[PDB]
Each structure stands twice: as C-alpha cells, then as structure tokens.
Amino acid sequence: REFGNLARIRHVISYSLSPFEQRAFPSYFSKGIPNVLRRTRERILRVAPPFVVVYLIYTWGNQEFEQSKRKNPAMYE
C-alpha cells in the first residue's frame, strides 16, 4: 500500500543530484527542439489524417449548404 512493500526491485542503482546544483533548463532549446520534432514525427500520422478529413468534411458541408441555398436557374418560368 505505502512505500516499502510496493514492488520487488533488486540490483538497481539510482543516481541523482541536487536541484540547487543542477540547471533547471539544461539545453532547453538545442535539445528541446529536436525532441519535440521527433515526438511530432512519431505521432503525426495518427492525428493529422483524421483532422484533415474533418477539415475537408467541414468545407464540403459549408460549400454544398451554400450551393443548396443558391437559386437553381431551372425555374426561369
């Protein structure tokens, strides 16, 4: 339940420093930009095609609604 009897971990060594001794933003841009680009490249082909077909359906529906509100020139008489 609490800390102490959660998991069984053996032979694992963890290394940590002080927050007051290490930087809060260590290479925030020079490493942040490639990481964000890599994450976007990894998960861009699962979200963008549904959102683009949403955009296409939205434009098609608005356009054909405007065309349905348009006057058909078949009723000249």
Binding site: I9, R10, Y15
Partner: protein, 160 residues
C-alpha cells in the same frame, strides 16, 4: 603480485559482503564525484587486475618521500634513542621526486547528491546522510564533535 591480486579480489568480495563499508564508499563516491575522493581505497576490480609492478614502483617512488613521513613512537620509548635510530635507518629515505614535479593536493568539490542501491532481498537497510565538513584545520571540528556527541550513537545491544 599475482598471489596478492587474488588476495585483494577475495578481500573485496568479503568487503562487499559487509554492508556499511559499501554505504560509506557509496557516500564518498556520490559526495566527491569527479574528484579523487570518490574512489575507494581498494580501487576497482579492473584496475586491480590490470595494474602491474611498474605502476606500483612508480607510486612507491612518487608518494614515499621523506617530508611526507612521520615516525611516531608511544610508550616506553626514549626520544633520543628514537632520534638516533631514525638517523641510523630512516636517513635519506627518498628525498628526491626524480622529476622535480611535486604533486599538489587540489580541493575536492562537494556536490549534494543521492545514490540508491536497491536490492530488496537484503534483510536490513543501511542509509547514510551527510553534508560537507570543515576539514582538519578548522576549529569548528570541536563544536561539530560536541553536536555529534549530543545526537550520538545507538544499537540494539544498549541497555539504556
């Protein structure tokens, strides 16, 4: 050299069998990392395996100079006799670095840090928490020893 290489290998195995020495070595490593105080007295097993007689003789001819040696005697010893015997035997021990390059003892950077060797099969847990001390030459060692005497020591053997 080879027989003792096996001997230190066995003794390091028995040393990691002991548990508080492991924690003191870990505390020294994580408190003085990047500095010559991180490494233990025994050194790593790969160094134990690869260093040879030439490196030992270089260490002997570098760090065993006369100005770094104290012949200390205590008990039923006469100072004049000790001085005469030192002049007889310990005279001109090395006195020469053979390269005119005296090694300087640079300060060691203390970094606040944390090392965890989790192994849940062990029966008890050893935890050491320390901060940076003043050093030998500081007069605050007396006050810090008074504080350490106030906090103290305890084990299950005590009948207090």
């Amino acid at each position: 050299i080879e027989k003792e290489r096996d001997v230190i290998l066995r003794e390091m195995q028995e040393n990691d069998a002991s548990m508080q020495n492991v924690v003191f070595d870990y505390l020294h490593a994580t408190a003085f990392q990047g500095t010559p105080l991180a490494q233990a007295v025994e050194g790593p097993s790969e160094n134990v395996r690869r260093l040879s007689r030439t490196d030992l003789t270089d260490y002997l001819n570098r760090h065993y100079k006369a100005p770094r040696m104290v012949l200390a005697a205590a008990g039923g010893v006469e100072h004049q006799q000790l001085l005469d015997l030192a002049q007889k035997h310990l005279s001109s021990v090395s006195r020469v670095y053979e390269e005119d390059a005296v090694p300087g003892l640079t300060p060691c950077r203390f970094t606040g840090s944390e090392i965890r060797h989790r192994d849940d099969a062990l029966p008890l847990a050893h935890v050491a928490i320390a901060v940076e001390g003043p050093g030998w030459a500081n007069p605050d060692n007396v006050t810090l020893q008074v504080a350490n005497a106030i906090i103290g020591h305890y084990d299950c053997t005590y009948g207090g």
